[PDB]
């Protein structure tokens, strides 16, 4: 601890340096948003969504995509 103190006052870059190294190694683990990144980026539609044949008995949005069925990004909205 004592060195820590002087280290905070002498060579006070490394201290800050390491501190950040860690804080970046922790925040991701504990955060209410970390999960969104893999979703928000997952959702972003880049490649055309090819439609499947309607053999039947499916929950897939038929016709207008506006159908209430399917995935939603209201989580992205009001995020």
């Amino acid at each position: 601890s004592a060195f820590l103190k002087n280290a905070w006052a002498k060579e006070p870059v490394l201290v800050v340096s390491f501190s950040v190294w860690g804080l970046a190694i922790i925040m991701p683990m504990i955060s209410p948003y970390t999960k969104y990144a893999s979703m928000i980026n997952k959702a972003t539609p880049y490649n055309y969504p090819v439609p499947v044949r309607d053999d039947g008995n499916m929950p897939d949005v038929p016709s207008h995509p506006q159908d209430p069925l399917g995935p939603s990004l209201d989580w992205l909205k009001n995020l």
Partner: protein, 96 residues
Amino acid sequence: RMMRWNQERRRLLIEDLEARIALMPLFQAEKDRRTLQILRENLEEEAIIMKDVPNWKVGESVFHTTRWVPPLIGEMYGLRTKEEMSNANFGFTWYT
């Protein structure tokens, strides 16, 4: 602020990607329609270029299989104007 701004920016990005998602069907048809035209047009000239050549099947898949295979850029514009070919070939690397 950066967190909120990029989240907004992301919303705009999903909006316009989806805008093409909707419009690509119109383009896909257009592309194919035009693509075939280029192949066929080349067929006409093809049926007029090596006619004299002996043992000359007007055209034949370089392959054996008979399934549609997307045409290479050269095939589409090879016989056509040099510029046309160049445009396609070096027309993106060179910005608008």
